[PDB]
Each structure stands twice: as structure tokens, then as C-alpha cells.
Design a protein around this ligand. Structure first.
Ligand SMILES: CO[C@H]1O[C@H](COS(=O)(=O)O)[C@@H](O[C@@H]2O[C@@H](C(=O)O)[C@@H](O[C@H]3O[C@H](COS(=O)(=O)O)[C@@H](O[C@@H]4O[C@H](C(=O)O)[C@@H](O[C@H]5O[C@H](COS(=O)(=O)O)[C@@H](OC)[C@H](OC)[C@H]5OS(=O)(=O)O)[C@H](OC)[C@H]4OC)[C@H](OS(=O)(=O)O)[C@H]3OS(=O)(=O)O)[C@H](OC)[C@H]2OS(=O)(=O)O)[C@H](OS(=O)(=O)O)[C@H]1OS(=O)(=O)O
Ligand SMILES: *[C@@H]1O[C@H](CO)[C@@H](O[C@@H]2O[C@H](CO)[C@@H](O[C@@H]3O[C@H](CO)[C@@H](O)[C@H](O)[C@@H]3O)[C@H](O)[C@H]2NC(C)=O)[C@H](O)[C@H]1NC(C)=O
Ligand SMILES: *[C@@H]1O[C@H](CO)[C@@H](O[C@@H]2O[C@H](CO)[C@@H](O[C@@H]3O[C@H](CO)[C@@H](O)[C@H](O)[C@@H]3O)[C@H](O)[C@H]2NC(C)=O)[C@H](O)[C@H]1NC(C)=O
Ligand SMILES: *[C@@H]1O[C@H](CO)[C@@H](O)[C@H](O)[C@H]1NC(C)=O
Length: 423
């Protein structure tokens, strides 16, 4: 039956390869909420350590006046799926990079199971206020013979059926179909995850994750109070920007160095949007430099309901980029190397030369008077073309950090930086 009601012994599944136990975060922090499996919560902490760390590298590789938008959950889910077929040093690297080894022995050895559990809690909860769904998938070459266990564990644990496409002969048309499926799952918001020419004739498998969020604000903004105003980019140019207005009671706190932290709850209170604004003339860099899940937890736990005036733009951002460079810097070497990569659990027919050529991410965010919409997707390509993509996106001034979190479980669904609010 269900992995949602099941327990480890119910579904005997343990993957092919297993990682060693290192030479237990000393002094467990953040006591778990009620009716919540210890193990799930630990996984939630693992992903949050990846979220902050990944952002750190990401924000370091862009101009400070750039927009950054991602869904670290999606990235984690997709790599965990990828992890199924990993072994030896490729698996250890994934384990460390994603923070999967920074938790207890049992949880560490049962990543996928707990991810299914954690996902059951995220998307399959009986008291929906806001919509939060997810869809996973495997797209593999039509002529190959994949490992049956691999399929089964991936369908059972992540809901990822395996769709056969003709990479070998119709490469270009396969990609489009993958993007069409991704567009479908994200309500036409993420239409182009995989970039032209990335998939080719030597392409074996494409692992995709999709996350979609749409929530109504708990305290709406009146459109008759929304107004226009010029926004001055760093360069010199300006653009129009519809700035919304509202007055009410909201969790807020003025922190160290004058940094303001504001919380905007979606109906239900299960999911909220946190905003982090540096002091008027203060750079975001320091805050971004000292961004650990501990510090974040401190800010949120200091917040005190207060009556205030909220001013925020009606906007839409979108980020699209490749994760190869960043992950490598962060420790993920083997997985992308055609000589050292070791993924022996994907294809039945002993073709053990696989390597992830490139992996793409793409997010979308829209904020308005009614609520907030967000979508995202990760696509990992096994054996295609490593291409060096888009090295230029608009630089604008005075950015704020945005976070779309799930409260009970403390999961960072979406996270980023809005520099250019003009649409
Ligand atoms: C070397 O040491 C490490 O490895 C060994 C060997 O493990 S191995 O066999 O994999 O090799 C570990 O030992 C095993 O682990 C035990 C453990 O408790 O983790 C134990 O697991 C099995 O039994 C437990 C308890 O059984 S119970 O039926 O009496 O409860 C079971 O855990 C329970 O799961 C419940 C669950 O349904 O979720 C929890 O309920 C809460 O959460 C639910 C929903 O969660 S979620 O929605 O967030 O996902 C919630 O729903 C309403 C409940 O409502 C309240 C919550 O309960 S509440 O009261 O807290 O609110 C239970 O409480 C939270 C939870 O008990 C702790 C476990 O299920 S699993 O955790 O999902 O896996 C089950 O696993 S099993 O299927 O594999 O059996 C094993 O005994 C059978 C034990 O094996 S042994 O017998 O050989 O020793 C070491 O674990 S430990 O240190 O002993 O804990 C492990 O150490 S470590 O990894 O270094 O920590
Ligand atoms: C297809 O993939 C499956 C994995 O999904 C491959 O089998 C896996 O192989 C390892 C060892 O070869 C198995 O682990 C074993 O677990 C036992 C538990 O008793 C342990 O004692 C052993 O020392 C070892 O660790 C793993 O369980 C296993 N199978 C499953 C169902 O998980 C299989 O080899 C792949 N087939 C092809 C053709 O590639
Ligand atoms: C993305 O894929 C989904 C299918 O997986 C497509 O949604 C499907 O669309 C039809 C209508 O276009 C849905 O049926 C509708 O049912 C409602 C009531 O439930 C009714 O009022 C409508 O007139 C229609 O009968 C169908 O259920 C739905 N499938 C799922 C699984 O949701 C969607 O169109 C796809 N998008 C694109 C662009 O292809
Ligand atoms: C590591 O790799 C070799 C083959 O490259 C394999 O024979 C060995 O079993 C692997 N070790 C572990 C612990 O998986």
C-alpha cells in the first residue's frame, strides 16, 4: 500500500550501494513539533543546511544587484532521486554535499523513505488552505534496458514513473516533450527548464522534479491602495513599479544592524513568506554571508506580532541557471566526470560509464494583492552535452531576500533575492 502510511519494514527496499558512517550534530537543536516523526524533521534540517549553503555559493557567483530565485527543495528531491543509482565516491559526495551525512545513522541509511514521508506531509495533507503540489519523473532512452528495481523504487518512493523517449534518433523533440511535461506540472509557469542542445544522441536518462505553490494572502492588499513609482536601477535607468500598500498586525522584528524581518502568512498559517530587508543604506552581503539555518531560526523566534505598514511591489521574477559549477565548488566532483562518475544502478544491461553531463534549475515567482504564486523544477541529464550557459542577466539596485517556508516542519520551499521589482 501507501508509503504515506507505511514503515521501513513494511516496504523492504534498501538501495544498491551504501555509504560509510563518518568519523550526529553535537547538541540537537530545534525540538520537533507535535505528531512529527523525529527522522522526518532531521531530513528537513538536512535540506535547510543545503538551502542556505547552496545559496551562499549562488549569491557569491552573481552580482549583488542581481535577482536570485530557486526552490532548494526541488534541487534536493532531484539529487536524492539521482542518488538511488550512485555508489562509491559519487554517492559519498552527494551524501555530504546535500547534508545527508549530518544526521543520524538510520535516517542517513534511509534517505529516500524519509523523503517520501516528508513529501507525504508537504503535498498530501488533509487540510489544504493553499495549494502545494509536486511531481517527479524519469525520462529514459527508448532502446535501453533500465534496472527494474531502480524503476520500482523510484516510482514507489518518489512517484517517478519512467517515460521512454527517443534520445538516440529524435533528441531535440525529446527535450521539448520533457519541457512540455514540466510546463504541465507547474501550471505553465516553468516552460523551458532544459535548454536547447543540452540533450543529444548519447543521452541516457533525464531525472526531473517539479514543485508548484499558489496561496492566498491571509491579510490581503487592496488594489485601490496599490500605486505606481519609478525604481532607480544601479546603472542609472529607471522603470515603473506598482507598489502595494496595507496596514495590519504582523510578526516583525528590527534586528542587528537595523535589519528588518517581516512575516507574511498565507491563509491557513501553515505556509508563510518571510522578508529580510537590510538597513536603508546597508549591503545585503553581510546578512547573506552569515546565513545559517540557526540564525534564520533565531530571527523567526524573535518576531513579535506588531501593528505596522507594509509596502511591497506587485511583481514577477524568474531565475534559470545550471547547477554544475556551484555543486562542484560545493564538493560534487565525481558525478559530472565521465571517468570518475560511478552510477551502476540505472541501466540493467551493464553500461557503467554513466555521468551527469549537466543539471538545470528554473524558478518563477509572482506576488500580488491576492496572494503569491511560485513554481520550480530541476532536470538532471545523464550523458549529454555540458554547455556553458547564460552569463548575463540584468543588474538593478536595492534587493531584499524572500523565503517561502512551511511552518510546522520548518522546510524552505522557495528562497531568493528580489533586486528588480519592476515588471
Ligand atoms: C545503530 O542504531 C541505529 O540503527 C538501529 C537499527 O535500525 S535498522 O533496523 O534500520 O538497522 C536503529 O534501531 C531501530 O530504530 C527504531 C527507531 O525507533 O527508530 C525502531 O524503529 C521501528 O519502531 C519505531 C517505534 O515503533 S512503535 O510502533 O512502537 O512506534 C518506529 O518509529 C515510530 O514511527 C512513528 C510513525 O508512524 O511516524 C512515530 O510517530 C510519530 O510520527 C507520526 C508520523 O510522522 S510523520 O508524519 O512526521 O512522518 C505521527 O503520526 C500521527 C505520530 O503521531 C504522534 C508521531 O508519534 S508521536 O507520539 O511522536 O507523536 C513514532 O514516534 C515519533 C516513532 O517512534 C520513535 C519506526 O518507524 S520509522 O521511524 O518510521 O522507521 C520503526 O522502524 S522499522 O520499520 O524499521 O521498524 C526499530 O525497532 C523495530 C529499531 O530496530 S532494532 O529493533 O533492531 O533496534 C536505531 O534507532 S534508535 O536509536 O534505537 O532509535 C538507530 O539509531 S540512530 O539511527 O543512530 O538514531
Ligand atoms: C538493480 O538495482 C538493484 C538495487 O536497486 C541492485 O541490487 C542491489 O545490490 C546490492 C548488492 O549487489 C544489494 O545490497 C545487499 O543487501 C543485503 C541485505 O541483506 C546485504 O547483506 C548485502 O551485502 C548487500 O548490501 C541491494 O539490496 C540490491 N537490491 C535491492 C533490491 O536493493 C541490482 O544489482 C541491479 N541490477 C542490475 C542488473 O544492475
Ligand atoms: C496538464 O495535464 C493535465 C492532465 O494531467 C491537464 O488537465 C486536464 O484537463 C482537463 C481539461 O482541460 C481536465 O478535465 C476537466 O475536469 C473539470 C472538472 O474536474 C471540468 O470542469 C473541465 O471542463 C474538464 O472536464 C482533466 O481532469 C485534467 N487532468 C488532470 C489530471 O488534472 C492539463 O490540460 C494539462 N495542460 C496542458 C497545457 O496540456
Ligand atoms: C567501489 O567501487 C568498486 C568498483 O569501481 C566496487 O567493486 C566496490 O564494491 C565499491 N565499494 C563500495 C563500498 O561500494
Amino acid at each position: 500500500v501507501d508509503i504515506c502510511t507505511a514503515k521501513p519494514r513494511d516496504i523492504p527496499m534498501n538501495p544498491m550501494c551504501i555509504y560509510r558512517s563518518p568519523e550526529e550534530d553535537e547538541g540537537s537543536e530545534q525540538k520537533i513539533p507535535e505528531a512529527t516523526n523525529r527522522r522526518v524533521w532531521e531530513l528537513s534540517k538536512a535540506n535547510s543546511r543545503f538551502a542556505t549553503t547552496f545559496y551562499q555559493h549562488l549569491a557569491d557567483s552573481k552580482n549583488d544587484n542581481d535577482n536570485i530565485f530557486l526552490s532548494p527543495l526541488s534541487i534536493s528531491t532531484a539529487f536524492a532521486m539521482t542518488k538511488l543509482g550512485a555508489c562509491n565516491d559519487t554517492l559519498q559526495q552527494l551524501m555530504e554535499v546535500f547534508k545527508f551525512d549530518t544526521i543520524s545513522e538510520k535516517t542517513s541509511d534511509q534517505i529516500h523513505f524519509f523523503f517520501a514521508k516528508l513529501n507525504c506531509r508537504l503535498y498530501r495533507k488533509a487540510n489544504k488552505s493553499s495549494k502545494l503540489v509536486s511531481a517527479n519523473r524519469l525520462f529514459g532512452d527508448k532502446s535501453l534496458t533500465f534496472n527494474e528495481t531502480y524503476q520500482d523504487i523510484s516510482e514507489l518512493v518518489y512517484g517517478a514513473k519512467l517515460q521512454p523517449l527517443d534520445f538516440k534518433e529524435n533528441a531535440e523533440q525529446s527535450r521539448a516533450a520533457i519541457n512540455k511535461w514540466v510546463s504541465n506540472k507547474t501550471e505553465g509557469r516553468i516552460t523551458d527548464v532544459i535548454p536547447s542542445e543540452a540533450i543529444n544522441e548519447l543521452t541516457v536518462l533525464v531525472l526531473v522534479n517539479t514543485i508548484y505553490f499558489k496561496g492566498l494572502w491571509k491579510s490581503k492588499f487592496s488594489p485601490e491602495n496599490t500605486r505606481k513609482e519609478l525604481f532607480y536601477k544601479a546603472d542609472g535607468e529607471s522603470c515603473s513599479a506598482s507598489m502595494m500598500y496595507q496596514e495590519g498586525k504582523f510578526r516583525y522584528r528590527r534586528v542587528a544592524e537595523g535589519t528588518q524581518v517581516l512575516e507574511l502568512p498565507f491563509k491557513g498559517d501553515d505556509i508563510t513568506m518571510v522578508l529580510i530587508l537590510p538597513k536603508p543604506e546597508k549591503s545585503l552581503a553581510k546578512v547573506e554571508k552569515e546565513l545559517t539555518p540557526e540564525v534564520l531560526q533565531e530571527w523567526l523566534d524573535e518576531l513579535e506580532e506588531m501593528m505596522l505598514v507594509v509596502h511591497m511591489p506587485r511583481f514577477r521574477i524568474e531565475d534559470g541557471f545550471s547547477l554544475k559549477e556551484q555543486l562542484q565548488d560545493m564538493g560534487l566532483v565525481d558525478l559530472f566526470s565521465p571517468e570518475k562518475s560511478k552510477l551502476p544502478g540505472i541501466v540493467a544491461e551493464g553500461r557503467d560509464d554513466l555521468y551527469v553531463s549537466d543539471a538545470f534549475h528554473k524558478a518563477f515567482l509572482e506576488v500580488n494583492e491576492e496572494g503569491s504564486e511560485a513554481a520550480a523544477s530541476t532536470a538532471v541529464v545523464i550523458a549529454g552535452r555540458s554547455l556553458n550557459p547564460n552569463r548575463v542577466t540584468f543588474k538593478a539596485n536595492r534587493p531584499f531576500l524572500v523565503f517561502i517556508r512551511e511552518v510546522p516542519l520548518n522546510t524552505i520551499i522557495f528562497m531568493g533575492r528580489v533586486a528588480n521589482p519592476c515588471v
